[PDB]
Amino acid sequence: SHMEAVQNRIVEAAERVPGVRGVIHLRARYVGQDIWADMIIGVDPENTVEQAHEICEAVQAAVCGKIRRIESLDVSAEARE
Amino acid sequence: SHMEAVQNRIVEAAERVPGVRGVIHLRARYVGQDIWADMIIGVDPENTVEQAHEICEAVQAAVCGKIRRIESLDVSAEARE
């Protein structure tokens, strides 16, 4: 439920970035006191690949900016809805 | 620095509420795993007392909404600038 709290913050942070259509997948693990995480976000299927890349970079900045204990975050995208 | 992280989140959360002119004072302590906190915010001296009360209630909701481990938060206001 400690990890629940952190994963909740990650999802909420990702969801507040323009162009995110949900968090499809989030795997977060402690490496010592640090979090390493891999994330898949949904995006508009009609976004370009370049736009999807930009959204991913924005999520990475947003999430890392808000959740200081994260020391690695890999964000990919999939078409949603 | 664990407590540093939580106090940083409290200040940032308070500062993002309309009408907050800085956090003047923040005393936060662990009661078990929970945080109990007392906060003074700055507000516009020309706000009414009722407006200051509203800002305080907004800060309380914002901070408690964002920082789940807080189980008590008392917010007062003082004139700033």
Side-chain angles (χ1 to χ4, degrees), chain A residues 5 9 12 65-66 68-69, chain B residues 5 9 12 65-66 68-69:
Chain A
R9 293 172 52 198
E12 289 184 28
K66 279 165 172 208
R68 254 55 254 301
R69 77 189 64 192
Chain B
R9 293 172 52 198
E12 289 184 28
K66 279 165 172 208
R68 254 55 254 301
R69 77 189 64 192

Side-chain angles (χ1 to χ4, degrees), chain A residues 22-49:
Chain A
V23 175
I24 292 171
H25 170 70
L26 172 59
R27 175 161 297 166
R29 299 298 186 266
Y30 277 102
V31 185
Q33 303 186 150
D34 298 339
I35 293 283
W36 292 35
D38 289 328
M39 240 196 167
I40 309 174
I41 57 163
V43 303
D44 180 351
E46 289 281 276
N47 285 166
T48 60
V49 170

Side-chain angles (χ1 to χ4, degrees), chain B residues 40-61:
Chain B
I40 309 174
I41 57 163
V43 303
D44 180 351
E46 289 281 276
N47 285 166
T48 60
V49 170
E50 187 54 14
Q51 284 167 325
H53 157 78
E54 288 172 2
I55 297 166
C56 288
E57 291 195 317
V59 166
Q60 207 200 11

Side-chain angles (χ1 to χ4, degrees), chain B residues 3 7-8 10 12-13 17 30 32 37-38 40 45 53 55 70 79:
Chain B
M3 249 287 197
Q7 288 196 95
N8 265 152
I10 295 167
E12 289 184 28
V17 177
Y30 277 102
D38 289 328
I40 309 174
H53 157 78
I55 297 166
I70 299 172

